[PDB]
Structure 1
Amino acid sequence: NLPTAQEVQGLMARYIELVDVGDIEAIVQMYADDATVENPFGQPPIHGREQIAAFYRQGLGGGKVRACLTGPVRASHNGCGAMPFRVEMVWNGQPCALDVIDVMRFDEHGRIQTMQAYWSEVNLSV
């Protein structure tokens, strides 16, 4: 029951759909109970739905964060995928933009076992 290549594209795309509208509950629910997240990748892994939950509450909390797939979801045959997307929020008062790429591995239940988001300052624009 590992998500197939097509199911991966669906789940990853849906994940962005939830971030764009700020459904913290639905996002957290997409993760495995013991899922880890590295955001930004390079940082120490944050483990557990509670810790991952806080993560989204604080970053999306303002309510004015948008997110959208900037390209197709590239999927593997082993329950993994990677996707390109942009995030629009506010920075220093003026509206900026962030280019990000998320690598995700799903457990045999269609839940995100691992998530890794690549991006740094070089990906921030005004």
Structure 2
Amino acid sequence: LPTAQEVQGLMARYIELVDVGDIEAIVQMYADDATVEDPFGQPPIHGREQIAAFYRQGLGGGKVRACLTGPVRASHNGCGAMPFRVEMVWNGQPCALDVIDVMRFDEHGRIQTMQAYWSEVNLSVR
């Protein structure tokens, strides 16, 4: 699996791709049989096309920005967790959302599972 150092780099790359809104590059980071649970607690999404649709729905508008708010924490079994903040516009109101993603990678360095922790308690109107 990817080493702890490689996990930190992969997860930081993911945030860069969200920040610039490169949906095709994000989708290509996922394994073909990956699952996304975002927000955690909702049913998982499976399949490349469904994941692409999810990111298009979320990042389509183009006014989404994202940045890490602390270091990526990485294990020795190909997993990591990271804290970040998303900025977006919601019916005129600029907003921010604090999120933690947990990811498990496969032997090819592709995301096998993603779980995103957030709810309305993590939402701020600016």
TM-score by length of 2: 0.98
- Is residue 92 of structure 1 aligned with residue 71 of structure 2? no
Whole-Å separation in 1 of the counterparts to 2:8 and 2:17? 14
Whole-Å separation in 2 of the counterparts to 1:93 and 1:121? 18
Whole-Å separation in 2 of the counterparts to 1:92 and 1:26? 28
Determine helix, strand or coil for the equivalent of 2:32.
strand
List runs of 5+ in structure 1 lacking aligned partners. none
Counterpart residue number, 2:38: 39
Structure 1 residue ranges (4+ consecutive) displaced by more than 4 angstroms after TM superposition: none
Greater shift, 91-100 or 9-18, is seen at 91-100
Whole-Å separation in 2 of the counterparts to 1:64 and 1:31? 23
Whole-Å separation in 1 of the counterparts to 2:26 and 2:36? 13
Whole-Å separation in 2 of the counterparts to 1:53 and 1:103? 19
1:63-82 pair list within 5 angstroms: 63-82=62-81
Whole-Å separation in 1 of the counterparts to 2:61 and 2:91? 14
Determine helix, strand or coil for the equivalent of 2:101.
strand
TM-score by length of 1: 0.98
Q: Identity over aligned residues, as a percent?
A: 99
Q: CA deviation at 1:92?
A: 3.1
Q: CA deviation at 1:125?
A: 0.2
Determine helix, strand or coil for the equivalent of 1:44.
coil
CA deviations over 1:75-95 (Å, ceiling 9, x no partner): 000000000000000123110
Whole-Å separation in 2 of the counterparts to 1:118 and 1:40? 6
Whole-Å separation in 1 of the counterparts to 2:93 and 2:101? 25
Q: CA deviation at 1:22?
A: 0.3
List runs of 5+ in structure 2 lacking aligned partners. none
- Is residue 109 of structure 1 aligned with residue 108 of structure 2? yes
